[PDB]
Amino acid sequence: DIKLFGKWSTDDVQINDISLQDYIAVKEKYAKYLPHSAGRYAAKRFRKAQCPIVERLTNSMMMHGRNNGKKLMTVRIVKHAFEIIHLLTGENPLQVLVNAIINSGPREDSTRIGRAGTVRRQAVDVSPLRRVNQAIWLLCTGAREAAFRNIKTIAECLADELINAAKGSSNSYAIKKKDELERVAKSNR
């Protein structure tokens, strides 16, 4: 058996949407012990859906300017973040991760169509891989905002967003930003 962090298992983790199912990783043969793998996943197109989505949450968390190469900093932020999820919920935190991802990526987006100087967006459809890509970005960004200038830890404030999105609650940052992009799109239609 291959436990993430030696203590979290994968066979419990259950994907709801078939839309996201082939574009969200670890269930069975993607199961790896650490997020850090360092493989060429952006060598050509549609290879970054085969990398483990904990490593996806890693690589989008080193993202800011002062943190911009420090991956072992980040897989430590991840490791302490799952164990705060488990102590607040008791669920396998990978399931909480996936239930926070699915509820986060929007499903219709606006797009500017027309000549320059004319702003008339039309709603289009959101790709499944982009809905993965949009959600992780919206998840990581909410960890920065409520934890840039206060006592709370980013290994902690990540776990407060990644729980509040698996509720689909209004308290999460990645939910309000889905409730805007997909609110604006249905006024563009």
């Binding site: 302490h80 164990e83 102590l87 607040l88 006592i151 709370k152 830890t153």
Partner: protein, 72 residues
């Protein structure tokens, strides 16, 4: 707004530490600071008192993150 925490405990605040805190399921110096108006050093040390009392378990300890739990 300004946030003026306490540096040493009060009679009432040391009770909230002794009585309420060991039933949180997630105990952390940032959390204790957030709920009790206490600076990070004092709340970080008070959890080391509550390990010496044995009232509280220990999950993980790091440079920056130390995680505690209610008693079983």
């Amino acid at each position: 707004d300004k946030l003026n925490n306490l540096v040493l405990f009060d009679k009432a605040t040391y009770d909230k530490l002794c009585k309420e805190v060991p039933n949180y399921k997630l105990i952390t110096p940032a959390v204790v600071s957030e709920r009790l108006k206490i600076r990070g050093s004092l709340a970080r040390a008070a959890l080391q008192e509550l390990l010496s009392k044995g009232l509280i378990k220990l999950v993980s300890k790091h440079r920056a993150q130390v995680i505690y739990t209610r008693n079983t």
